Symmetry: C3
Subunit: 116 residues, 3 copies
């Protein structure tokens, strides 16, 4: 059994599958500048990668949520996050403050999920 990959470049693959596990690269926003829009864009990108890798939102196992300013943006993050999640099926989660690769990025989320 060897890992399979989705959207591979010289630095990373957007997803790596092995056994029944899906490992996603941390996903960053599109063009939104605000925390609400950026969180929507991150979660939408995760949604698509899960689909490509044979998983789905109900089968997320863990998410690390990185916020550039956790005090300022935690409430907005939770608002978009809880609406995005399938009811009653929230994953394990860790939310911490960290600067991301670009200063305009307010939120980045790293997901591990189950294939199925």
């Amino acid at each position: 059994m060897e890992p399979t990959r989705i959207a591979t470049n010289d630095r990373l693959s957007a997803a790596v599958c092995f056994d029944a596990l899906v490992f996603l690269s941390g996903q960053v926003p599109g063009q939104a500048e605000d925390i609400h829009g950026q969180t929507r864009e991150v979660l939408a990108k995760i949604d698509a990668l899960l689909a490509e890798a044979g998983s789905r939102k109900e089968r997320i196992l863990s998410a690390t949520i990185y916020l550039k300013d956790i005090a300022r943006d935690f409430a907005a993050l939770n608002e978009v996050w809880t609406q995005w999640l399938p009811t009653g099926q929230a994953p394990s989660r860790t939310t911490v403050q960290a600067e991301l690769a670009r200063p305009s990025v307010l939120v980045e989320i790293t997901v591990v999920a189950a294939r199925g």
Copy 2:
């Protein structure tokens, strides 16, 4: 095979099990204000979640330890951590500095463990 969950709310589940793996949400302290007490409270909460999920301390696979002030609190963290761990059975570990969701939180720990 579908994931099972423990202590699910609208934002997260305290634990998600899949296959023989246990994914715990990052655990934060109780009411302690000092690094020693907070680390004890975090590890005790992890201890209970492992028990609920069919694991135990000897079967931890990985721990990310987030410290609000790694320079100040690293030694105290290690003191409580090494005493809490079963002898000779320490897991893989990563210790980094990050602000947590509340400024009074000095330590948060995210564990993945093996069911058994």
Copy 3:
């Protein structure tokens, strides 16, 4: 099935294996003081731990890359990283800013990999 461990001390094991998974402790540099040298030293240590644990670079599933100064060092990190990776086989990746246990440490990397 119980976890097995490599290079266990009172705080951590350099590697923990379970099922077909390898969990590595975050690896820190040797004596280099510059970002290029430190990244080389980190990746070399990861390379050896994978070998000891029955894995290899082509079977990395995920890497969290912590940089002390992501704005300053991201380009240098990517330069060493992309050269170190086997062609076409990059893993899932997340790169964030975090202070490490010593102020002289500029980079720390935490890998999960597949045994095989």
